[PDB]
Amino acid sequence: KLHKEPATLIKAIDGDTVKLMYKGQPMTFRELLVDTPEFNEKYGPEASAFTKKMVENAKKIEVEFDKGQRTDKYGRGLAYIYADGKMVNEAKVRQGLAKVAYVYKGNNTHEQLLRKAEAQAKKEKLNIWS
Ligand SMILES: Cc1cn([C@H]2C[C@H](OP(=O)(O)O)[C@@H](COP(=O)(O)O)O2)c(=O)[nH]c1=O
Ligand SMILES: [Ca+2]
Numbered sequence: 001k002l003h004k005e006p007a008t009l010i011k012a013i014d015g016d017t018v019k020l021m022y023k024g025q026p027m028t029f030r031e032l033l034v035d036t037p038e039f040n041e042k043y044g045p046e047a048s049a050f051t052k053k054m055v056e057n058a059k060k061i062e063v064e065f066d067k068g069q070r071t072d073k074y075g076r077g078l079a080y081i082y083a084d085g086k087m088v089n090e091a092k093v094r095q096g097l098a099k100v101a102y103v104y105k106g107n108n109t110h111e112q113l114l115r116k117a118e119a120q121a122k123k124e125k126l127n128i129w130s
Helices: 044-057 088-094 111-123
Strands: 004-012 017-022 025-031 061-064 077-083
Touching: 004 044, 017 061, 017 077, 025 088, 044 077, 044 088, 077 088, 088 111
Parallel strands: 025 077
Antiparallel strands: 004 017, 004 061, 017 025, 061 077
């Protein structure tokens, strides 16, 4: 079982990263288990906007670390990010604005939940799957 922890938004960055204050320190977080198009790729601007809206509108941001590595080789926090209880990682995949990706053993608790969301976005031909 994983645990949600508090954080506050410092700044939206792009489709799958955001700047949050966590235990009182500014950090860039990179969303576990997903990949968004870069800004210049088809759907890249839409993904950034989607994440932005979701984190900016949240009254409460939380981060949830998985069982494995909590920071990547770039110093980015690796987490599932929640906005008012709704996982931002999942919500983007469900809308076809991210693909499930970067699934490493031991940081993959939510892998099946996210693949189910992606299956539904693909069935619906949403966005990336259009
Ligand atoms: C999501 C994720 C990315 N990464 C590293 C793998 C990729 O290395 P490389 O930079 O060498 O390609 C990079 C992709 O992140 P981005 O999609 O933000 O570019 O982030 C991790 O190590 N663990 C993770 O869980
Ligand atoms: Ca990316």
